[PDB]
Assembly symmetry: C3
Homo-oligomer: 432 residues x 3
């Protein structure tokens, strides 16, 4: 019986009674792939127009609205757009008189269709539009949505049931120690390694060549990591949005001298202010937007400060308990298992069902694509295992492998299982 | 000293030096009862009406609006309803002219009160209503709320401080090993069981009665995002608490409006009149954006996102056989005196347990059979997470006594430290 | 070898083979300082006015609106205010006729600027305003926001990687056992303590003098602790708000006989009702507000029922394993480490980078302001450590200490790192 402490740093080693060297530190986990995450990025554009446009769209407003921002914002999430008539046509035109701008602008929309809201804004300052001989004309357009910038999108994998792996060389023999498997064979005995507890759940931020950054925790959306993209926009299949979503932005036409400008817009609020033109029949637009969560996320900067290059592990040391004890040699079945069926999902957080027939002549130390799922006595077995690998599944008892039958879906498919995505439609018929 | 690995599957057994059989696998935990959970289920109804109704309510609109959906939706959470006047009376009537439909409809509501919003919709297509000889009349009603379907409601218990229980039989003698209690007695020695770590928190989804299991908090940011736990929370299965969606945004959208090229957002309800096959009648097409961008199918979600049993690591267990025998310590068997229990049970906040431990040794205290620790004779005080409701039977290992209790249930705890409902205030004249 | 169970209560002790006494129970953790937390406290005020005021502000409405509530609510978070004209001037006045109250009140605002919304309310009952000789005049003002009451604000520290510390006295010799360090040296040989698992994450609620209250968990915002201020208003620097925020309150003028009053207002909704006056040209106002989360949080009461005076620990007992085995004597470097640099943050949840040069003579059992960060062989070292102490950092191998160079920020600074706070402004120029 002997005892020694082994430090956890590279190069750490003990020589007596048996040479033990710390080869490295890694980890095991049950992966939960969340798909794509990004910040809620409110973006706004518009124009102050000394005219009553007949086509309220990016192409129809091309003479005033910035081209690239309009197209990008138009394609965003929870789009909101308003067209305000500040001073309409006094005579002539085509559905451009003040009478066509009723609340909601249904009269204008009849002749000039648009996906945007149309509202009267008579009474608001028209000072920004000048240089007209008789009839002063003015309108304001505002457009805002939650835009998905590719550089701000991150792939996130949650690591559950985390086990720190202390890679040891015990008298030249490889031994990977964890809280689950803390024993190593020594030349004529056994080494039991006392290890610190596991670090709990980890967050793997995958940047895109491909690089992984690490968070320690769930994460905690109520602490210093509140601005994590995990706390924001969630797309399980990196295409469709699910769960918590901000409301459509609230667009407001605010005059330059309005006392409201002494305060800041709230989250999702967009305040637009016409700017007096230096040129005749032209005007600028000042836009004030309240970002979601009260701040704009800077992706490379957030990742650099809120993550580490490697997963965290406790400082140690490890307690090396050397014993003269030798484990009892048990006979094991080396033949492959038969009629193995795998059902459920992988990298999803819900254990998959693994069932089959273990062969005779000992316990089958079952592996599913090399993943340890436990040992089973001969005959029928059933287990619930958290799988990290996709199908097809190669099943073995430690010897030759066989192909299992599988009905296993991916994490993105699991995220959409048990739900009917999109618009729910219903019809109310006329009475008989 | 001897060592052997014991697998964790049914039928697993070792024979030397003393036989150890894996009898079963269960778990211990500190229960946190969350009450009732359900998805945020947006439901909408309405009618296209070739008339200007004077009573905007389920009964008042009975001739057009479907009866059962109206009554159910009207009683829902965060109800929203709008009555649009598309084409009003040209003459006569009673507060039915276009002039009564000012924005917000205050003039109409003065003579025809309603809990619904009233708005003008002049300029919208009235083509759906035909067959009028001199005065075409049209109105549209839309009603939406977050409805509670009983089949979608689940009872949820969170399991904290989870301890996997490896039920062993050591030469016929029952031994329940956990990370807290890993020692067993063997005929002539002691068995120390090396066990894997505990699985962390569990989620128990209670159907109807059947229990289904989730592993985790749950994680509302991953594949289990649509869990009812991530949605509507009712601690007492009656009153709603916490995060709630806004009232639905109802919009009258004409069949040819370019807005129909896009999908409604979460909580948005777009209604479109459908031309009648009969004179002075019309239909209504409803497009609703569900909360979270998808409609939850309860039996289907539960089947794919839960297991029949709680998860446990694959093992094996490390059986360390020792010739060591534990030192016999004196135990007090008399019941504890003047025991007081204060706080809550199945709530997540440890309850205060205080009393007097009797003489003759340490009192291995149990509260309704739950182990709360051992105490030396005299005054004791402990903070224990209780899983059982009052009354509390207290024992030191022998006879039991009735403790005095001021313990509330999880639903009562959820409403403790808060004043529920509408906050009313009066501003008096100077 | 010998074995005995040791209970975890005060007064617990074992006599044989070596006397062991339970001296106390404490804990170690990696602190995550969240800053300030408070409930979302919706507060509303207003007035029923038998006049058409020309200044819609707290001072301008001083003759009708309660002074202290107006000033407090005006300075609140996500402020909303509406001025409704129920019955305007029939003649005369200054931008007070019905024609100035178009939807949105732009005509009125042109002459009478206000940060509040202005809306017509003609058609609503004006019965509350009576005793006018010829021209009946009536308006209604409502104001609401999320107010920060100092007594409702709590400082919160999240405790991660929690380790219960069982303080023992092994024959008068102090030994602090944890799941990380369960061994005690004895003259016989060694005492190995079998301990229960750690309790998981803790929540430390700091009141005010200064008192700490304890929660067990993350917390769970979906269970009985749903009303925790942690689940509500978050201010990392106890000044600026971040994350999830309710919408601006939805103010509505609701007549006394409106069927809407048979239902309760939703969260963030404020319904105002004029009350018929006993005095001529005067009226009262009844306010119905739907609190955030469907209930108003009572801070001392919530804390008393949802927290404990001390952090929770399992009941035990501890398994005392007495061995004749003596640990192997390893050489330790006692000289201070050289060129130590510390980069990152402390009490933030992100491990800081610690790098330097370990001296000769054995392994350097490195401490950063007394915090154990591991042992390193002589030479260059690099480690990722969760730090609980602020800079400056005193570094030691177990002997004399040296001053490390540091670029370490506080938890409030970390919360604002990687973000640009406030209003995002953009200008669209003329072509
Ligand atoms: C907007 O979306 C449409 C349809 O997917 C696509 O054709 C167009 O190129 C997109 N524009 C931009 C700027 O992304
Ligand atoms: C330890 O882990 C390494 C890396 O995964 C592997 O190559 C080695 O075979 C493992 N050793 C044992 C004994 O399993
Ligand atoms: C082990 O657990 C079972 C089931 O609860 C019980 O019947 C048995 O008595 C327990 N054994 C011991 C030694 O406590
Ligand atoms: C145990 O902890 C106490 C309190 O922090 C301390 O005074 C004592 O020195 C510690 N004992 C050892 C052996 O570190
Ligand atoms: Ca008047
Ligand atoms: Na004009
Ligand atoms: Na008509």
């Amino acid at each position: 019986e002997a005892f020694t402490y082994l430090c956890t740093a590279p190069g750490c080693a003990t020589q007596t009674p048996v040479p033990v060297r710390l080869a490295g530190v890694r980890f095991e986990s049950k992966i939960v792939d969340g798909g794509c995450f990004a910040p809620w990025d409110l973006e706004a554009t518009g124009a102050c127009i000394c005219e009553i446009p007949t086509d309220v769209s990016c192409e129809g407003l091309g003479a005033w609205v910035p081209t690239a921002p309009c197209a990008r914002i138009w394609n965003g999430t929870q789009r909101a757009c308003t067209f305000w008539a500040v001073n309409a046509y006094s005579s002539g035109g085509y559905a451009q008189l003040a009478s066509y701008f009723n609340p909601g602008g249904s009269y204008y929309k009849q002749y000039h269709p648009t996906a945007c809201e149309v509202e009267p804004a008579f009474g608001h300052s028209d000072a920004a539009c000048w240089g007209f001989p008789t009839d002063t004309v003015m309108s304001v357009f505002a457009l805002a949505s939650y835009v998905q910038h590719p550089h701000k999108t991150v792939r996130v994998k949650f690591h559950t049931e985390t086990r720190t792996v202390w890679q040891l060389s015990v008298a030249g023999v490889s031994c990977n120690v964890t809280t689950e498997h803390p024993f190593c064979n020594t030349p004529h005995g056994q080494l039991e390694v006392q290890v610190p507890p596991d670090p709990g759940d980890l967050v793997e931020y995958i940047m895109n060549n491909q690089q992984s950054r690490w968070g320690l925790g769930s994460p905690n959306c109520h602490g210093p990591d509140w601005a994590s993209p995990v706390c924001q926009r969630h797309s399980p299949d990196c295409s469709r949005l699910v769960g918590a979503t901000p409301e459509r932005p609230r667009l407001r036409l605010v005059d330059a001298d309005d006392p409201l400008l002494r305060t800041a817009p709230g989250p999702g609020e967009v305040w637009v202010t016409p700017v007096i033109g230096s040129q005749a029949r032209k005007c600028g637009l000042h836009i004030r937007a309240g970002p979601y969560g009260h701040a704009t996320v800077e992706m490379p900067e957030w990742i650099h400060a809120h993550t580490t290059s490697d997963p965290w592990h406790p400082p140690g040391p490890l307690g090396l308990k050397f014993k003269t004890v030798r484990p009892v040699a048990l006979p094991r079945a080396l033949a492959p298992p038969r009629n193995v069926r795998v059902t459920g999902c992988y990298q999803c957080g819900t254990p998959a069902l693994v069932e089959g027939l273990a062969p005779g002549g000992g316990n089958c130390h079952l592996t599913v694509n090399g993943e340890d799922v436990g040992a089973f006595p001969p005959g029928k077995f059933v287990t619930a295992a958290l799988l990290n690998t996709p199908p097809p599944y190669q099943v073995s008892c430690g010897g030759e492998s066989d192909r299992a039958s599988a009905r296993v879906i991916d994490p993105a498919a699991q995220s959409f299982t048990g739900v009917v995505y999109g618009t729910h439609t219903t019809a109310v018929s006329e009475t008989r």
